[PDB]
Amino acid sequence: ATEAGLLGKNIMGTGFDFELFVHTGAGRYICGEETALINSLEGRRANPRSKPPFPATSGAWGKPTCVNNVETLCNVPAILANGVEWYQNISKSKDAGTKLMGFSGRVKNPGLWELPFGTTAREILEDYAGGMRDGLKFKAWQPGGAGT
Amino acid sequence: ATIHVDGKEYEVNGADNLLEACLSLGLDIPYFCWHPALGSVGACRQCAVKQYQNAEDTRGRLVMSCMTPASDGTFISIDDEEAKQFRESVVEWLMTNHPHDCPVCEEGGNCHLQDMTVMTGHSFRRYRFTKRTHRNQDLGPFISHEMNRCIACYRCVRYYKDYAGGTDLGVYGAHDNVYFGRPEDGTLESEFSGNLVEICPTGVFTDKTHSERYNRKWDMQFAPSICQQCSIGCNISPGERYGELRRIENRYNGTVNHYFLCDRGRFGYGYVNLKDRPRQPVQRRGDDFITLNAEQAMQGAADILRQSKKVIGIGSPRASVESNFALRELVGEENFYTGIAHGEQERLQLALKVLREGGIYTPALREIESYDAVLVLGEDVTQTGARVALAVRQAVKGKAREMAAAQKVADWQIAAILNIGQRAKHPLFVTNVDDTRLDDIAAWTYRAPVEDQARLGFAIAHALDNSAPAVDGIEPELQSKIDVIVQALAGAKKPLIISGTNAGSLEVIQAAANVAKALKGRGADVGITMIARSVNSMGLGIMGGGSLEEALTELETGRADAVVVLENDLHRHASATRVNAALAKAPLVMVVDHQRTAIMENAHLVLSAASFAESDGTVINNEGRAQRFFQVYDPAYYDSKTVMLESWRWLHSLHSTLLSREVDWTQLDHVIDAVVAKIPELAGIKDAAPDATFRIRGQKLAREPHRYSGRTAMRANISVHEPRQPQDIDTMFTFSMEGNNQPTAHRSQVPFAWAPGWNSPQAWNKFQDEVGGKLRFGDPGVRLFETSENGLDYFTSVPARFQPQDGKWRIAPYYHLFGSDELSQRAPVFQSRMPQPYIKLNPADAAKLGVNAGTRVSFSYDGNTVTLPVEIAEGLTAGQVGLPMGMSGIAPVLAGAHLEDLKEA
Amino acid sequence: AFELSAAEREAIEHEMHHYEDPRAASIEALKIVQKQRGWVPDGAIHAIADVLGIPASDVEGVATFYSQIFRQPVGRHVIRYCDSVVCHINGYQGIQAALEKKLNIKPGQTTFDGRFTLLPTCCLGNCDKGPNMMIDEDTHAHLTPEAIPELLERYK
Numbered sequence A: 001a002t003e004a005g006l007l008g009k010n011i012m013g014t015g016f017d018f019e020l021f022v023h024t025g026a027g028r029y030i031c032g033e034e035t036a037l038i039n040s041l042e043g044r045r046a047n048p049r050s051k052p053p054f055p056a057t058s059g060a061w062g063k064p065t066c067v068n069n070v071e072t073l074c075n076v077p078a079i080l081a082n083g084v085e086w087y088q089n090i091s092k093s094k095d096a097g098t099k100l101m102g103f104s105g106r107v108k109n110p111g112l113w114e115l116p117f118g119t120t121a122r123e124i125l126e127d128y129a130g131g132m133r134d135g136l137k138f139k140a141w142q143p144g145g146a147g148t
Numbered sequence B: 001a002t003i004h005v006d007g008k009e010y011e012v013n014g015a016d017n018l019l020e021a022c023l024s025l026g027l028d029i030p031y032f033c034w035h036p037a038l039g040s041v042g043a044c045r046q047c048a049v050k051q052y053q054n055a056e057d058t059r060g061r062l063v064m065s066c067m068t069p070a071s072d073g074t075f076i077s078i079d080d081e082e083a084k085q086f087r088e089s090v091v092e093w094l095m096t097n098h099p100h101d102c103p104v105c106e107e108g109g110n111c112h113l114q115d116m117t118v119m120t121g122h123s124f125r126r127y128r129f130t131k132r133t134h135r136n137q138d139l140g141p142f143i144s145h146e147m148n149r150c151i152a153c154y155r156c157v158r159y160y161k162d163y164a165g166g167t168d169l170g171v172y173g174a175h176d177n178v179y180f181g182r183p184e185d186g187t188l189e190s191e192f193s194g195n196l197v198e199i200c201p202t203g204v205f206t207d208k209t210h211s212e213r214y215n216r217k218w219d220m221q222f223a224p225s226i227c228q229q230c231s232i233g234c235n236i237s238p239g240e241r242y243g244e245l246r247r248i249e250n251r252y253n254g255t256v257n258h259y260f261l262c263d264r265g266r267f268g269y270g271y272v273n274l275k276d277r278p279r280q281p282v283q284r285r286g287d288d289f290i291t292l293n294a295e296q297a298m299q300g301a302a303d304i305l306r307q308s309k310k311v312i313g314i315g316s317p318r319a320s321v322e323s324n325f326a327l328r329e330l331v332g333e334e335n336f337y338t339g340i341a342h343g344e345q346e347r348l349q350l351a352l353k354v355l356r357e358g359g360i361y362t363p364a365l366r367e368i369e370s371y372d373a374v375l376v377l378g379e380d381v382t383q384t385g386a387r388v389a390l391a392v393r394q395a396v397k398g399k400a401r402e403m404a405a406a407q408k409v410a411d412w413q414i415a416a417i418l419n420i421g422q423r424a425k426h427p428l429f430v431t432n433v434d435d436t437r438l439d440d441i442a443a444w445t446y447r448a449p450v451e452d453q454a455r456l457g458f459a460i461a462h463a464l465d466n467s468a469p470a471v472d473g474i475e476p477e478l479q480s481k482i483d484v485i486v487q488a489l490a491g492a493k494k495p496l497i498i499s500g501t502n503a504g505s506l507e508v509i510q511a512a513a514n515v516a517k518a519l520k521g522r523g524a525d526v527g528i529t530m531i532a533r534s535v536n537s538m539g540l541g542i543m544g545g546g547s548l549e550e551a552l553t554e555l556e557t558g559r560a561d562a563v564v565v566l567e568n569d570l571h572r573h574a575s576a577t578r579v580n581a582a583l584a585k586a587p588l589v590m591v592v593d594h595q596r597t598a599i600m601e602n603a604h605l606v607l608s609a610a611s612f613a614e615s616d617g618t619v620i621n622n623e624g625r626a627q628r629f630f631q632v633y634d635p636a637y638y639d640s641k642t643v644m645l646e647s648w649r650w651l652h653s654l655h656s657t658l659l660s661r662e663v664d665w666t667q668l669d670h671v672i673d674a675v676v677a678k679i680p681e682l683a684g685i686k687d688a689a690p691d692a693t694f695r696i697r698g699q700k701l702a703r704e705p706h707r708y709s710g711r712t713a714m715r716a717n718i719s720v721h722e723p724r725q726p727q728d729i730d731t732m733f734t735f736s737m738e739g740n741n742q743p744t745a746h747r748s749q750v751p752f753a754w755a756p757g758w759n760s761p762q763a764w765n766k767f768q769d770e771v772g773g774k775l776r777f778g779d780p781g782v783r784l785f786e787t788s789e790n791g792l793d794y795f796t797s798v799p800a801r802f803q804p805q806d807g808k809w810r811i812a813p814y815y816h817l818f819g820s821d822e823l824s825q826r827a828p829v830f831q832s833r834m835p836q837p838y839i840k841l842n843p844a845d846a847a848k849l850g851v852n853a854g855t856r857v858s859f860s861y862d863g864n865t866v867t868l869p870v871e872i873a874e875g876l877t878a879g880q881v882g883l884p885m886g887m888s889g890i891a892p893v894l895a896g897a898h899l900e901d902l903k904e905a
Numbered sequence C: 001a002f003e004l005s006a007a008e009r010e011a012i013e014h015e016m017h018h019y020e021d022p023r024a025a026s027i028e029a030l031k032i033v034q035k036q037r038g039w040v041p042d043g044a045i046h047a048i049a050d051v052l053g054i055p056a057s058d059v060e061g062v063a064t065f066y067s068q069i070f071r072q073p074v075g076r077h078v079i080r081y082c083d084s085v086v087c088h089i090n091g092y093q094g095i096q097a098a099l100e101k102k103l104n105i106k107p108g109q110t111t112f113d114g115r116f117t118l119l120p121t122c123c124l125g126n127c128d129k130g131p132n133m134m135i136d137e138d139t140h141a142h143l144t145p146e147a148i149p150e151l152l153e154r155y156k
């Protein structure tokens, strides 16, 4: 993208300068916490920070900072290339847009599928994950990771 | 702002957090990670209160009172059952890994964790699993390390790194194996590492020097005293047990030294406990040393003084105001000589003239932390006035404070402040003959000889105001850096100019006065600070008198045939050969001193004076603040034959025995009234502390805690019969626990902090009007002089630049916090921390000499050839040779002298 | 005792170009030294601190805070088997038993020949293909306890 003129100085003739870097971490779960992400980006121990102040006003090196997930920024270009009305007219739920959902652990088809919000967990588990494996009975589930 | 705590309405400061506001109201909230000087971080999670949305809210929410602003209409509950349960739970979680160590822990009885465990009500253990353990580190001679007792409250790293600016202490590791210490074994490098023993709320960091001779806090006899190890006059609580000085605790003073000392004043008390001190008057008769009691010593000394023609008195800046005045009265005003050299005295009286006639307000030590720009001229502040260096560091962090206040971030939210002000800091410009310890935060450092530092100061003054004398021969790059300094100083709202007499140059002080006068002419709120050398240097300067050279001239010419030397070893202010010859010429030498000095071999009478622990008196700050120090203990309580009186008591009785042939052991307030009657510029010392008739509702102030042990056994091995309690006619304090030490008592002299439920140094919160403020009824001490209405003139004696001339070597003074002071370097724990005697040389000069690093060179000064090993100093300038002042064989009077015959041995 | 190589110093300085504060390159500098030497030795902390202009206390605290910055010597290959909940459900304990019985070491230990260092790690982000392992740079998914003695023979 830098060689193709999509990054660096004067992108698309607009005059906007944007430099993108990739910073590979050194293995701590707490580094995903956004204030602790900022602290780890500054080269410190990734202890979190109290809020307020939020990173929007005092974030990375004191400057304003916006921390967003990978999937949110992956959602952004479709919003800006197809419009607002398309994004609110793909799911009849209070949560607009689509989400990468998926069931894991001793199901027939463990994986990941992009589904609209409002999809029930039963139809994910039975149609996309295929239900549980042979000779296993479903006793529990966690909806959104180890912290739920 | 208005807050409602448990239904009770309180009026507080809305700019405070709820923890400091509620502690100021006498409410008890347990806390670990918060400090009044370090701010709030929210680590320990101990200070939980329950906040409600309004008056008609019942469910509430647990908030952390140190991270919650005390805004208007706030509703909190401390004594809510859920808040109490959670605070007990936090104490319990800390207790899960804590070692069973209290009987063998130096913090016991003084432990903030012990206090908060008791306060939360947690005494039942239901944890059955193992405790984590840690290996300890060796942190040097002063601090003992025990990581098992740590509760991971992060106070040590916050203090040592964010506050004291030290770089070798950190936190290592993760989840529950966090380790607070150095990256490897070795001595802690910061000059303020001693305050970790009071910052740490557990026994992880403890006083190793006290651990050698440990006694619990309830067993101490405490007194409010002044530190004697430099001119800053930090308030201390020395505490004794079994007749020896045991510990120096910090004594809170919201105006001077609030929570912190330096390592010299905290750990160099050990000269008091030396076994070779004079404990009895000794008269030399032939080769015999006859021990006398007080009466016959006074009679013999008075007879010898009466048969002599002229008696001269040589004082000291070590001795109190009362002692120096008593010597001045005994020998006469015209016969009284200050014990310092002529050049030292000239620099001292110039510093005094700038302070009390220059029309620029000299700040207190606490107020230094509010200045917007700092210029340090010639003075190695970290090695001579270290608490001024710490206050300078806080003033430098003031810029991040202002930036965070611009974004509506509260003043206690220290992590947000340090994040907003990343590396931005207020301008600091230091000058020295080499590198200093303030170079890490200095915007610029100038390594130059004292003439060139003075010329830089004069040029800064000329660029700020053209009426100041101009400096010719300024290089274009030095002129550019001078313009940088001028732009930083001119734009500051509150500039501060720091200098002192330790640089060894009159012109450095003149340049600092010129910069301050130029800044005052532009209307700036400029302050000036002067660092004197000894504890009572400004008091001896205000008293005045001839130099030591004049006294030696009188002794050598035979015009004086009797010399009384008060608390002076005479070798740190003059050459030893001249002093020895002059004292050997006199037919009477009488040394009134508390330390075995080298001039006692020639002395015909030695009066065993008392040190600051065994005496009362007044000392004057470097800022001109009169401060009383009170006696800690009676030296004769355990050894009945010890005749160790106050110096002024000895000299007043000697004067009375010379006049009316009878001994008169006077009282301290009589001597103070004599001072304020005869010397009108010292009239402020009367109000430094109240008289011996001061009572709190009829009772004296207690020196020892109310649970003092061993009353009928501490002297039983000497005699089973209990002696009389020692009588203190001099002060308002009693040598017992039959007295008052209430935090709500109307006094300002607090011997030690203790409240029921607060046995730690956190007990000081009860003795203060607001936490981190002043003492409840004002700080002790009184300024002698106000800011003058009219200023000085510009000093026009601009020196020429340093010319390195062949054969001569200009002695550049290097100061060390451990070694430059006399009494503290006599203390046996300092020899481990002392630097080796190293003579500093430029690479060019050492290459010219054919000398590398480490080889020993011999040089002759005043007919005395001494040999020292060479250390290469890149920051030094050629033609200069570096010497450590105050060490063995190197008097501080050598600062600015020249050297001859510097050749390899 | 320790001397940084020229390539290490150039990589550290080029990392320092990317950040507003040179302290922000501390993790990458530690990873550069670790990639060059297998682990970060004791003198490397002071060398990195001198290059970056920050105290060695903060570099040591960063090195001991992060689990993938090895402050003790490791083997030539670092096996990292996933510990977390989905690999627990899929049976990482059989994989751990197979690794221990083949290498004759506990987790956190190195074999006598210095060939392997066994380490448990957190989730590897490969939970639908568990149980998961990570030898030095390669992720191996769909593990079975019978595939371990064959999979450890392609790491000499």
Ligand SMILES: Cc1cc2nc3c(=O)[nH]c(=O)nc-3n(C[C@H](O)[C@H](O)[C@H](O)COP(=O)(O)O)c2cc1C
Pocket: A029, A030, A031, A032, A033, A034, A035, A067, A068, A069, A070, A072
């Ligand atoms: C302990 C902890 C760990 C977290 N780890 C991550 C993470 O690894 N990745 C992530 O995107 N968010 C993580 N978060 C959530 C972030 O704080 C933040 O909500 C998110 O990264 C960005 O917000 P967004 O959802 O609008 O994109 C974590 C939060 C906590 C409390």
Ligand code: SF4
Pocket: B098, B099, B100, B101, B102, B105, B106, B107, B108, B109, B111, B112, B113, B114, B149, B201, B202, B203, B204
């Ligand atoms: S730190 Fe306090 S609670 Fe812990 S062992 Fe020492 S005295 Fe006891």
Ligand code: SF4
Pocket: B149, B150, B151, B152, B153, B154, B155, B156, B157, B180, B199, B200, B201, B202, B204, B205
């Ligand atoms: S060593 Fe002391 S001050 Fe430091 S975190 Fe531990 S308990 Fe707190």
Ligand code: SF4
Pocket: B227, B228, B229, B230, B231, B232, B233, B234, B257, B261, B262, B263, B264, B265, B266, B385, B386, B387, B388
């Ligand atoms: S700064 Fe000076 S007065 Fe204060 S503790 Fe240190 S030596 Fe004593």
Ligand code: FES
Pocket: B019, B030, B031, B032, B033, B034, B041, B042, B043, B044, B045, B046, B047, B064, B065, B066, B067
């Ligand atoms: S004192 Fe408030 S959380 Fe530590």
Ligand code: FES
Pocket: C082, C083, C084, C085, C086, C087, C088, C122, C123, C124, C125, C126, C127, C130, C131, C132
């Ligand atoms: S649980 Fe093992 S890869 Fe996620």
Ligand SMILES: [Ca+2]
Pocket: B615, B616, B631, B728, B730
């Ligand atoms: Ca007394």
